[PDB]
DNA sequence: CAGCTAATGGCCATAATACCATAATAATAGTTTTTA
DNA sequence: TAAAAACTATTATTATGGTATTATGGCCTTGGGC
């Protein structure tokens, strides 16, 4: 609630631009998210908290162009990929939702890559990527896998983020469906 | 790093008024001054940020929530409709409407204003250095009534200068250009001159460009056994624009176009693997790796080597090509080339001798033979530096340099000419300068962009002479070129 | 040539071309087709929407060509560094009716006596360009011309806060090393007086001694062109002969190369 | 025609572009320290 | 055992260039018995 109210509210006023305001916001409610934790009350209370801030930020920073909010998705995306391990499962709504979500966060790097942040962008999406993965999907991922495996198939980029260059190339391997696997191991 | 520069207009009352004078309110003159530097940083395109604020007035624009202020804009590198947004403010209709619509003049209090604009130095979120501010006032008397305001001037003033933050008052014509000397110090805050006006500002920055830059730092091993690291510097690059940027049509927005290689036969892709770097001639196509190419450069490494000592006068121009930009040998990191490099230049210049090097550009190259003249160190009383101590980075001449140039006979002149020719040139000569020299015909386009910047009719359409002025040509010298013309010839041109 | 970037495994350029791939800007920023776009910028904080049209029209220029003396000056205030450019024009007559080439010589020696330099517009002819630059007579007795070159343009001077080397007050040794390594500077003087023609033959005498990039490649060219793929091809030291000065000078540097290390230490 | 055109054969400068490649800064992590 | 900071170093940042490259750049060359 203060989690949820303070997040959707202050984060909402932030839709006129936030800068430090949002980020620390993202920090405190995000960071003081888990350090304040209890089974029952706080565990599943979060489960809805996390749940509906998912539904939020997909919208929120999806809209948000880059600006402050490249750094807002520093704060978040870090808190995201680390909040994967929070729920190994009960992911399914947020499995798929975050699936094409962070897909489009690759896309948000695709708007503007590089600088300092967009590194942090795709990088944080990468650990966002796998510990997420239970298998449990087929072409919800595989679809993504395809032209991820294009998006990294190419694209001279910084020395730093180059993990993505290879990032999903075997992660698509953990996606068992053949013919894309064919595509890659031919290509790779 | 990308710094602060600040416009401000004083207000007591009559300032936005014209003093009932029949030209302009010097307030407005200031207006176009603001225009001029903010616009100026279109051209110069300076990551320095600019300030537009007034005070001393009826209503307010601020966050400090006090009487007699207005913000105009927060610190910025400019904007086109930041320009336009401010462009309302010329003209008596815009004088007034600007005034009243914002409200114009009641009272003020001085150092209050200080930390006003200073507290626009609050506005810094980024890396700036220069704290530089300008007040626009004819005010002869800040006040006589409360000299506690005066103590406040002499009080917070020293703070704000001590803040490293610097405002002065240029000589903006209160009568005499000002008649006041008297108490004025507080109001205000490599050998040059100073000016009282904007015109200097205007033209001076019409073509102007970047200032603080030194980046990629190489080395010179002198021998194998001893060290210097060499600062690479551009006196200029033959400065050019930031070049045409991709923005799509109605969307107006950056394309974020990308490029890679599809297969150009089959609908597939292509990869740097899948290709290579070739030379082809005649029958034989020959293909060798982009790597193989890029390391075929390899001889040593980026870095430099004293290769010897040569008469400076040995080569003046039999020759010339792509310039030295100026490497200053670094001495902080590696000093003693403080001393070493010092006496080096001392005596090598004394010898009229120079240090040849083989320069190896960045991420290797094939390196090249280039002389280094020792560059002398020129400073006057206030230290005009024409010759920052260093080296002339002197490309050597090579085959390509001489790849071709003709030779044949030459038929020669007579002193009968030179008797006149000399003074003729004395009429054709000018003492020249360091300054007002460019290729404006490119400047004219960031004029053409000054257009959309102001969104107006015709550019500044300013004046440099890169083209000769006929009245002087036919004036000082005259037609004596006739004498020359019929000297040896009835030309018919 | 560019290092022709074409195919591997075939070499056939048929598969070969790069990807246009023009995109939209943001929020999936997807493909855009029909390459045409406006031609614009950001500058400052401001996007600079604009076209190629308003460019072309709004652009003042030269005509198709011209070359016009912009004036003259003495050479005293003038500096080699402040000779700028790369391309340089030996300029000879349109002759046959050579008269104004002779009077040209007249103005030339009107320049050379008084150390006089030329200030001239130059618009290159064949296709549509304005330019402006310095030009100056060079004198080598048998034949001479004026050379068009770029006048360094007022922006062209970068200048720093640099504290003077005129201040050595933090750095001085005893001269007693400095003089000696001067004598080195002689032993390392590349051009010393030779032939008693007062032609000091600069070891590394520039000139007929080329630069690698081409030479280097050329060895790559005979090798790989004429022999199969290999690692680094012969660097044959005639290469490095050129690269490195002669060791009578260098030998004469050796013990001075010693006095370097000895007399002149290092830090870091 | 008159002379063959005259756009054919050629194409150099550019500007543009690219790659492509750093400091100006600001981070990472980092391996030690014992603590436990 | 790790386990704590930890000031250190790293490699991370571009803004800014320079290469290097593209492209034709609007021109000089080619043609045929009437």
């Amino acid at each position: 609630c203060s989690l949820l109210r303070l997040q959707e509210t202050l984060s909402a006023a932030d839709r006129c631009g936030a800068a430090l305001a949002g980020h620390q916001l993202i920090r405190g409610l995000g960071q003081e998210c888990v350090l304040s934790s209890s089974p029952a009350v706080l565990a599943l209370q979060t489960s809805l908290v996390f749940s509906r801030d998912f539904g939020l930020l997909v919208f929120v920073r999806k809209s948000l162009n880059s600006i402050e909010f490249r750094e807002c998705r520093e704060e978040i995306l870090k808190f995201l990929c680390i909040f994967l391990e929070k729920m190994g499962q009960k992911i399914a709504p947020y499995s798929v939702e975050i699936k094409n979500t962070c897909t489009s966060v690759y896309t948000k790097d695709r708007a503007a890559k590089c600088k300092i942040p967009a590194l942090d962008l795709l990088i944080k999406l990468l650990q966002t990527f796998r510990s997420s993965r239970l298998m449990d999907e087929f072409k919800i991922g595989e679809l993504f896998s395809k032209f991820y495996g294009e998006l990294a198939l190419k694209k001279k980029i910084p020395d730093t983020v180059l993990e993505k260059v290879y990032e999903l190339l075997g992660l698509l391997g953990e996606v068992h469906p053949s013919e894309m696997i064919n595509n890659a191991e031919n290509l790779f | 790093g990308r710094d602060s520069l600040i416009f401000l207009v004083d207000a007591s009352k009559a300032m936005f008024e014209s003093q009932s004078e029949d030209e302009l309110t010097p307030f407005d003159m200031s207006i176009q001054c603001i225009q001029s530097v903010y616009i100026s940083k279109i051209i110069s395109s300076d990551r320095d940020l600019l300030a537009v604020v007034f005070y001393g007035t009826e209503k307010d624009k601020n966050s400090v929530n006090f009487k007699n202020i207005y913000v105009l804009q927060e610190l910025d590198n400019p904007g086109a409709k930041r320009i336009l947004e401010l462009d309302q403010f010329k003209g008596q209709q815009g004088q007034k409407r600007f005034q009243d619509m914002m409200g114009h003049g009641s009272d003020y209090s001085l150092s209050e204003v200080l930390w006003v604009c200073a507290n626009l130095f609050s506005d810094v979120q980024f890396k700036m250095s220069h704290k530089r501010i300008m007040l626009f006032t004819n005010e002869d008397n800040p006040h006589g009534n409360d000299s506690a305001k005066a103590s406040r001037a002499r009080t917070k003033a020293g703070d704000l200068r001590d803040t490293g933050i610097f405002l002065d008052l240029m000589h903006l014509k209160k009568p005499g250009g000002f008649d006041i000397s008297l108490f004025y110090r507080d109001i205000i805050s490599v050998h040059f001159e100073e000016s009282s006006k904007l015109e200097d500002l205007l033209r001076k920055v019409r073509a102007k460009e970047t200032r603080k830059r030194a980046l990629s730092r190489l080395k010179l091993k002198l021998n194998k056994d001893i060290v210097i690291s060499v600062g690479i510097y551009n006196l200029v690059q033959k400065a050019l624009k930031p070049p045409p940027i991709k923005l799509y049509r109605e969307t107006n927005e950056p394309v974020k176009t990308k490029t890679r290689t599809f297969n150009t036969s089959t609908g597939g892709l292509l990869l740097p693997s899948d290709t290579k770097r070739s030379q082809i001639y005649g029958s034989r196509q020959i293909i060798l790796e982009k790597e193989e190419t890029e390391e075929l450069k390899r001889f040593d490494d980026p870095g430099l080597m004293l290769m010897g000592f040569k008469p400076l006068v040995l080569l003046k121009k039999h020759h010339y090509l792509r310039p030295s930009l100026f490497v200053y040998p670094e001495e902080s990191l590696v000093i003693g080339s403080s001393t070493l490099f010092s006496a080096l230049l001392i005596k090598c210049l004394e010898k009229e001798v120079a240090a040849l090097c083989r320069y190896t550009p960045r991420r290797n190259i094939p390196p090249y033979f280039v002389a280094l003249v020792p560059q002398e160190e020129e400073l006057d009383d206030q230290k005009i530096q024409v010759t920052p101590p260093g080296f002339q980075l002197v490309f050597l001449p090579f085959a390509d340099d001489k790849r071709k140039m003709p030779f044949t006979e030459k038929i020669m002149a007579t002193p009968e000419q030179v008797g006149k020719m000399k003074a003729i040139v004395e009429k054709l000569r000018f003492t020249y300068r360091s300054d007002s020299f460019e290729n404006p015909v490119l400047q004219q386009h960031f004029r053409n962009l000054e257009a959309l910047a102001l969104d107006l009719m015709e550019p500044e359409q300013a004046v440099d002479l890169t083209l000769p002025k006929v009245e002087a040509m036919n004036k000082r010298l005259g037609s004596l070129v006739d004498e020359f013309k019929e000297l040896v010839y009835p030309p018919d041109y | 040539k560019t290092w022709t970037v074409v195919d591997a495994k075939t070499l056939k350029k048929e598969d070969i071309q790069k990807e246009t791939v023009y995109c939209l800007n943001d929020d999936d920023e997807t493909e855009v087709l029909k390459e045409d776009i406006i031609q614009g910028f950001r500058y400052g904080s401001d996007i600079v929407p604009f076209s190629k049209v308003d460019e072309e029209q709004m652009k003042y220029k030269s005509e198709g060509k011209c070359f016009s003396v912009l004036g003259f000056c003495k050479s005293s205030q003038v500096q080699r560094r402040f000779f700028m450019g790369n391309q340089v024009l030996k300029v000879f007559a349109a002759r046959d009716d050579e008269a104004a080439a002779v009077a040209l010589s007249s103005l030339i020696h009107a320049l050379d006596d008084l150390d006089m330099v030329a200030i001239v517009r130059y618009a290159y002819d064949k296709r549509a360009n304005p330019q402006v630059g310095v030009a100056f007579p060079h004198i080598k007795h048998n034949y001479e011309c004026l050379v068009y070159v770029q006048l360094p343009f007022m922006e062209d001077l970068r200048q720093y806060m640099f504290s003077s080397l005129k201040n050595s007050k933090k750095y001085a040794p005893t001269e007693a090393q400095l003089n000696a390594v001067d004598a080195l500077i002689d032993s390392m003087s590349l051009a010393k007086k030779d032939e008693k023609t007062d032609t000091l033959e600069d070891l590394f005498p520039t000139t007929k001694i080329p630069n690698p990039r081409f030479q280097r490649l050329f060895q790559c060219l005979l090798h790989r062109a004429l022999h199969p793929r290999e690692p680094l091809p012969p660097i044959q030291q005639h290469i490095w002969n050129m690269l490195n000065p002669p060791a009578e000078v260098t030998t004469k540097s050796q013990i001075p190369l010693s006095k370097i290390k000895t007399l002149f230490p290092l830090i870091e």
Side-chain angles (χ1 to χ4, degrees), chain A residues 147-176:
Chain A
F147 301 174
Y148 299 158
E150 289 183 350
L151 69 81
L153 185 59
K154 290 198 297 184
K155 310 294 180 291
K156 288 192 63 61
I157 50 141
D159 292 344
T160 75
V161 66
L162 298 176
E163 54 180 341
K164 73 182 190 74
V165 175
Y166 291 80
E167 191 71 17
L168 312 175
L169 297 177
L171 298 177
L172 62 84
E174 293 184 353
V175 177
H176 319 292

Short mmCIF file of all heavy atoms in Angstrom, two decimals, chain A residues 147-176:
data_model
loop_
_atom_site.label_atom_id
_atom_site.label_comp_id
_atom_site.label_asym_id
_atom_site.label_seq_id
_atom_site.Cartn_x
_atom_site.Cartn_y
_atom_site.Cartn_z
N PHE A 147 14.15 -13.04 -32.98
CA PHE A 147 14.75 -11.81 -33.42
C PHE A 147 15.39 -11.04 -32.28
O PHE A 147 15.88 -9.93 -32.50
CB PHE A 147 13.73 -10.98 -34.20
CG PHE A 147 13.18 -11.70 -35.42
CD1 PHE A 147 12.15 -11.15 -36.16
CD2 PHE A 147 13.72 -12.90 -35.85
CE1 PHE A 147 11.65 -11.80 -37.28
CE2 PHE A 147 13.23 -13.55 -36.95
CZ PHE A 147 12.19 -13.00 -37.67
N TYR A 148 15.41 -11.59 -31.08
CA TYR A 148 16.57 -11.34 -30.24
C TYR A 148 17.81 -11.84 -30.94
O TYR A 148 18.73 -11.08 -31.24
CB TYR A 148 16.47 -12.04 -28.90
CG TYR A 148 15.32 -11.66 -28.07
CD1 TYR A 148 14.88 -12.51 -27.08
CD2 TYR A 148 14.73 -10.41 -28.18
CE1 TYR A 148 13.86 -12.17 -26.26
CE2 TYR A 148 13.68 -10.07 -27.37
CZ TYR A 148 13.25 -10.96 -26.41
OH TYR A 148 12.21 -10.66 -25.57
N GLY A 149 17.81 -13.13 -31.25
CA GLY A 149 18.91 -13.74 -31.95
C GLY A 149 19.20 -13.08 -33.27
O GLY A 149 20.25 -13.31 -33.85
N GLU A 150 18.26 -12.27 -33.77
CA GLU A 150 18.67 -11.27 -34.74
C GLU A 150 19.29 -10.05 -34.08
O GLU A 150 20.36 -9.60 -34.50
CB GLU A 150 17.48 -10.86 -35.61
CG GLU A 150 17.03 -11.92 -36.59
CD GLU A 150 15.90 -11.45 -37.48
OE1 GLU A 150 15.34 -10.38 -37.21
OE2 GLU A 150 15.56 -12.17 -38.44
N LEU A 151 18.67 -9.51 -33.02
CA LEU A 151 19.10 -8.20 -32.55
C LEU A 151 20.55 -8.23 -32.08
O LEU A 151 21.27 -7.24 -32.22
CB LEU A 151 18.19 -7.68 -31.43
CG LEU A 151 18.13 -8.30 -30.03
CD1 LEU A 151 19.27 -7.82 -29.15
CD2 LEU A 151 16.81 -7.95 -29.40
N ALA A 152 20.98 -9.36 -31.53
CA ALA A 152 22.37 -9.55 -31.19
C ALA A 152 23.18 -10.16 -32.33
O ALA A 152 24.41 -10.15 -32.27
CB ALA A 152 22.50 -10.46 -29.96
N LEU A 153 22.51 -10.64 -33.37
CA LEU A 153 23.20 -11.28 -34.48
C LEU A 153 24.14 -10.31 -35.18
O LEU A 153 24.88 -10.71 -36.09
CB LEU A 153 22.16 -11.84 -35.45
CG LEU A 153 22.42 -12.69 -36.69
CD1 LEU A 153 23.14 -13.94 -36.30
CD2 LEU A 153 21.08 -13.07 -37.29
N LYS A 154 24.12 -9.05 -34.77
CA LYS A 154 24.57 -7.93 -35.56
C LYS A 154 24.96 -6.81 -34.60
O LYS A 154 25.27 -7.08 -33.43
CB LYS A 154 23.48 -7.54 -36.57
CG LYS A 154 23.30 -8.57 -37.67
CD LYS A 154 22.58 -8.06 -38.89
CE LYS A 154 21.15 -7.63 -38.63
NZ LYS A 154 20.50 -7.22 -39.90
N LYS A 155 25.00 -5.57 -35.10
CA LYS A 155 25.00 -4.39 -34.25
C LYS A 155 26.28 -4.11 -33.47
O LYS A 155 26.36 -4.45 -32.29
CB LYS A 155 23.85 -4.48 -33.24
CG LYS A 155 22.52 -4.80 -33.86
CD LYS A 155 22.06 -3.68 -34.75
CE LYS A 155 20.73 -4.01 -35.37
NZ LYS A 155 20.89 -5.10 -36.36
N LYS A 156 27.29 -3.53 -34.11
CA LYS A 156 28.45 -3.04 -33.38
C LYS A 156 28.04 -2.11 -32.25
O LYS A 156 27.27 -1.16 -32.45
CB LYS A 156 29.40 -2.32 -34.30
CG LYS A 156 30.10 -3.27 -35.19
CD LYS A 156 31.22 -2.54 -35.86
CE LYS A 156 32.19 -2.10 -34.79
NZ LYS A 156 32.75 -3.26 -34.07
N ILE A 157 28.59 -2.37 -31.07
CA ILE A 157 28.08 -1.83 -29.81
C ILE A 157 29.23 -1.74 -28.82
O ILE A 157 30.35 -2.15 -29.15
CB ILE A 157 26.95 -2.71 -29.28
CG1 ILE A 157 27.43 -4.15 -29.29
CG2 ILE A 157 25.66 -2.46 -30.04
CD1 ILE A 157 26.99 -4.93 -28.11
N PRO A 158 29.02 -1.23 -27.60
CA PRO A 158 30.15 -1.08 -26.66
C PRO A 158 30.73 -2.40 -26.18
O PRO A 158 30.03 -3.41 -26.08
CB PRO A 158 29.53 -0.31 -25.49
CG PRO A 158 28.44 0.45 -26.10
CD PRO A 158 27.86 -0.45 -27.15
N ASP A 159 32.01 -2.33 -25.82
CA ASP A 159 32.83 -3.46 -25.38
C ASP A 159 32.24 -4.12 -24.15
O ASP A 159 32.61 -5.24 -23.77
CB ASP A 159 34.25 -3.01 -25.03
CG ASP A 159 35.04 -2.55 -26.23
OD1 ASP A 159 34.64 -2.85 -27.37
OD2 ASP A 159 36.08 -1.87 -26.03
N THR A 160 31.31 -3.42 -23.53
CA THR A 160 30.86 -3.67 -22.18
C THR A 160 29.67 -4.61 -22.18
O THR A 160 29.68 -5.67 -21.55
CB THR A 160 30.50 -2.33 -21.59
OG1 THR A 160 29.25 -1.93 -22.14
CG2 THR A 160 31.48 -1.38 -22.12
N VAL A 161 28.63 -4.20 -22.86
CA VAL A 161 27.36 -4.89 -22.94
C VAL A 161 27.47 -6.15 -23.79
O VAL A 161 26.50 -6.89 -23.94
CB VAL A 161 26.32 -3.92 -23.50
CG1 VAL A 161 26.68 -3.60 -24.94
CG2 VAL A 161 24.92 -4.47 -23.34
N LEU A 162 28.65 -6.42 -24.35
CA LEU A 162 28.79 -7.46 -25.36
C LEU A 162 28.30 -8.83 -24.92
O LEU A 162 28.21 -9.75 -25.73
CB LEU A 162 30.25 -7.60 -25.76
CG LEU A 162 30.91 -6.38 -26.38
CD1 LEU A 162 32.37 -6.69 -26.63
CD2 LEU A 162 30.22 -6.02 -27.67
N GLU A 163 28.04 -8.99 -23.62
CA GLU A 163 27.36 -10.18 -23.14
C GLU A 163 26.13 -10.46 -23.97
O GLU A 163 25.89 -11.59 -24.41
CB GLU A 163 26.99 -10.00 -21.67
CG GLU A 163 26.19 -8.75 -21.42
CD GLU A 163 25.83 -8.57 -19.98
OE1 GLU A 163 25.89 -9.56 -19.22
OE2 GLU A 163 25.49 -7.44 -19.59
N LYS A 164 25.35 -9.41 -24.23
CA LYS A 164 24.15 -9.57 -25.02
C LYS A 164 24.48 -10.12 -26.39
O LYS A 164 23.69 -10.86 -26.98
CB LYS A 164 23.41 -8.24 -25.15
CG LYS A 164 24.07 -7.21 -26.08
CD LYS A 164 23.24 -5.92 -26.06
CE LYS A 164 23.64 -4.88 -27.12
NZ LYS A 164 23.22 -5.22 -28.52
N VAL A 165 25.65 -9.75 -26.92
CA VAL A 165 26.09 -10.27 -28.21
C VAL A 165 25.90 -11.77 -28.23
O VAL A 165 25.41 -12.35 -29.20
CB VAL A 165 27.55 -9.90 -28.47
CG1 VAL A 165 28.02 -10.55 -29.75
CG2 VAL A 165 27.69 -8.41 -28.56
N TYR A 166 26.30 -12.41 -27.15
CA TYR A 166 26.09 -13.83 -27.01
C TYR A 166 24.94 -14.19 -26.09
O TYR A 166 24.55 -15.36 -26.05
CB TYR A 166 27.38 -14.44 -26.52
CG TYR A 166 28.40 -14.37 -27.61
CD1 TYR A 166 29.11 -13.21 -27.87
CD2 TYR A 166 28.57 -15.43 -28.46
CE1 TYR A 166 30.00 -13.16 -28.91
CE2 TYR A 166 29.48 -15.40 -29.45
CZ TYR A 166 30.19 -14.27 -29.69
OH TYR A 166 31.07 -14.26 -30.74
N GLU A 167 24.32 -13.20 -25.45
CA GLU A 167 23.50 -13.45 -24.27
C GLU A 167 22.57 -14.63 -24.46
O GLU A 167 22.68 -15.65 -23.76
CB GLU A 167 22.66 -12.22 -23.95
CG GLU A 167 22.01 -12.32 -22.62
CD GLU A 167 23.00 -12.17 -21.51
OE1 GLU A 167 24.13 -11.68 -21.77
OE2 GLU A 167 22.67 -12.56 -20.37
N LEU A 168 21.66 -14.52 -25.40
CA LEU A 168 20.57 -15.46 -25.48
C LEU A 168 20.88 -16.62 -26.42
O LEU A 168 20.03 -17.50 -26.59
CB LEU A 168 19.32 -14.71 -25.95
CG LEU A 168 19.14 -13.42 -25.13
CD1 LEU A 168 17.98 -12.61 -25.66
CD2 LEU A 168 19.00 -13.64 -23.64
N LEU A 169 22.07 -16.63 -27.01
CA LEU A 169 22.35 -17.57 -28.09
C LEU A 169 22.31 -19.01 -27.62
O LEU A 169 22.03 -19.91 -28.41
CB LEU A 169 23.71 -17.25 -28.70
CG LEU A 169 23.65 -15.85 -29.31
CD1 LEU A 169 24.99 -15.44 -29.86
CD2 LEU A 169 22.58 -15.83 -30.38
N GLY A 170 22.65 -19.25 -26.36
CA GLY A 170 22.40 -20.55 -25.78
C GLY A 170 21.17 -20.54 -24.91
O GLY A 170 20.61 -21.59 -24.61
N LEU A 171 20.75 -19.35 -24.47
CA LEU A 171 19.50 -19.29 -23.73
C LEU A 171 18.36 -19.72 -24.62
O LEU A 171 17.41 -20.38 -24.17
CB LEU A 171 19.29 -17.88 -23.19
CG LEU A 171 20.43 -17.54 -22.23
CD1 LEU A 171 20.37 -16.13 -21.67
CD2 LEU A 171 20.47 -18.55 -21.11
N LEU A 172 18.45 -19.38 -25.91
CA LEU A 172 17.58 -19.97 -26.90
C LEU A 172 17.82 -21.47 -27.02
O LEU A 172 16.92 -22.20 -27.42
CB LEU A 172 17.78 -19.28 -28.25
CG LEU A 172 19.13 -19.31 -28.98
CD1 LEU A 172 19.31 -20.58 -29.81
CD2 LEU A 172 19.31 -18.08 -29.85
N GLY A 173 19.02 -21.92 -26.69
CA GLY A 173 19.25 -23.35 -26.62
C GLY A 173 18.38 -24.01 -25.57
O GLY A 173 17.75 -25.03 -25.83
N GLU A 174 18.31 -23.40 -24.38
CA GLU A 174 17.36 -23.89 -23.39
C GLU A 174 15.94 -23.81 -23.89
O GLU A 174 15.05 -24.41 -23.28
CB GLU A 174 17.49 -23.12 -22.08
CG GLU A 174 18.79 -23.37 -21.38
CD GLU A 174 18.84 -22.67 -20.06
OE1 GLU A 174 17.92 -21.89 -19.77
OE2 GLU A 174 19.80 -22.90 -19.30
N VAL A 175 15.70 -23.09 -24.98
CA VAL A 175 14.43 -23.21 -25.66
C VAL A 175 14.61 -24.29 -26.72
O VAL A 175 15.19 -24.07 -27.78
CB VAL A 175 13.99 -21.89 -26.27
CG1 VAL A 175 12.69 -22.07 -27.04
CG2 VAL A 175 13.85 -20.85 -25.17
N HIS A 176 14.05 -25.41 -26.45
CA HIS A 176 14.23 -26.67 -27.15
C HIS A 176 13.70 -26.65 -28.58
O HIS A 176 14.24 -27.38 -29.43
CB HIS A 176 13.57 -27.71 -26.27
CG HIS A 176 13.85 -27.48 -24.82
ND1 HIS A 176 15.11 -27.62 -24.28
CD2 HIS A 176 13.06 -27.01 -23.83
CE1 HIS A 176 15.07 -27.30 -23.00
NE2 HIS A 176 13.84 -26.93 -22.70
#
